[PDB]
Write a protein that binds this ligand. Structure first.
Ligand SMILES: [Cl-]
Length: 349
């Protein structure tokens, strides 16, 4: 179908931080997609941003609307499955935010129910479109670092004050940030042989996990995923070592802040990351170095991808299949931490 002359009507569920910050602005900015309606308690909270405000007070009404094609579910973690089921039952396509589901049993159920009903089911791993990650994918594809042997990925922050993330996730940031990092690691290197996770609470007053250090092990490779809320000094986002060179990048992707600030698509300079990383290469037993041009972040690619998948033009940007694998590693991290062991990944096709 045409993204010029045809529209996929979308139903958004609730107006939480996610709907407000990501889903609304991004669906709105995507040609071919039309945000038909949003279910919410306080429409006034919505209209302040997006009137027309075809607001409804109950998600089941959107499910009812027969013209609606797609349903996005960024509500509280525990509602995902119910709402998701209801949605697939109503014969509607579904995008679920993270965490996918409270249970693997649930996730797979949706994967099946959605597959039998010929509907599209996808999860919002938007960070596959972070400026740094895109740039990196391209660097590896070109092979200048040689054979990659080490990958280090951090989201280190400094918030010593205990008032940020209500409520809890036991959580804590492993549930909140793990999925993003794990998914990237899988996308770049596939499945590891073992996962070893060390969860922590280093901040006095923390109620949930506020620290995690994960090691994913591969034949001749190591991947280190790390986060913390007690890092006053800025640390590298990525550190990548190959047999021929290295790549170190600082900063985070800049889209989230600009969306928070209320910016609407399109922007001449959407996603520009002016904080370039640096490549170091060994040419003739000499180490040279230069900055690597950072590709702009591109979250919109997700919904444009969803659009195109609905119309059957292209592959689901993020299959449930892949979300479920990340979810499995999230649980395996918990187990690994409980046993203080590097646990093996199992049960592959
Ligand atoms: Cl080894």
């Amino acid at each position: 179908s045409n993204a010029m002359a045809d529209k996929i009507k979308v139903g958004l569920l609730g107006y939480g931080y996610a709907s407000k910050t990501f889903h609304a602005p991004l669906i709105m900015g995507t040609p071919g997609l039309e945000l038909a309606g949003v279910s919410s308690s306080d429409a006034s909270k919505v209209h302040a941003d997006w009137p027309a405000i075809p607001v409804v007070s109950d998600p089941q009404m959107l499910f009812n609307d027969p013209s609606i094609d797609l349903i996005v579910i960024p509500t509280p973690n525990d509602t995902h499955f119910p709402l998701a089921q209801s949605a697939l039952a109503a014969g509607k396509h579904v995008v679920v935010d993270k965490p996918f589901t409270v249970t693997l049993s649930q996730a797979n159920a949706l994967k099946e129910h959605a597959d039998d009903a010929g509907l599209l089911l996808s999860v919002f791993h938007n960070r596959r479109w972070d400026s740094d990650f895109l740039t990196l994918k391209t660097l590896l594809a070109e092979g200048s670092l040689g054979n990659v042997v080490y990958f280090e990925s951090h989201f280190d922050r400094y918030r010593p004050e205990i008032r940020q993330r209500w409520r809890e996730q036991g959580g804590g940031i492993w549930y909140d940030l793990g999925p993003h990092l794990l998914d990237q690691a899988l996308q770049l290197f596939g499945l590891p042989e073992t996962l070893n996770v060390d969860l922590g609470m280093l901040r006095p007053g923390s109620q949930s996990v506020d620290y995690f250090h994960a090691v994913l092990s591969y034949p001749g490779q190591r991947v280190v995923l790390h986060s913390t809320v007690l890092a006053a000094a800025e640390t590298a986002r990525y550190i990548v070592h190959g047999t021929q060179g290295s790549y170190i990048k600082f900063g985070v992707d800049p889209q989230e802040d600009r969306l928070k600030a209320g910016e609407r698509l399109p922007q001449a300079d959407w996603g520009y990351d002016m904080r370039d990383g640096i490549v170091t290469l060994s040419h003739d037993n000499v180490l040279t170095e230069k900055p690597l041009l950072t590709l702009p972040g591109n979250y919109p690619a997700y919904y444009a991808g969803i659009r195109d998948a609905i119309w059957g033009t292209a592959p689901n940007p993020v299959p449930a299949t892949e979300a479920i694998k990340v979810m499995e590693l999230i649980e395996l991290g918990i187990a690994s931490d409980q046993q203080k062991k590097a646990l093996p990944i199992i049960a592959k096709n």
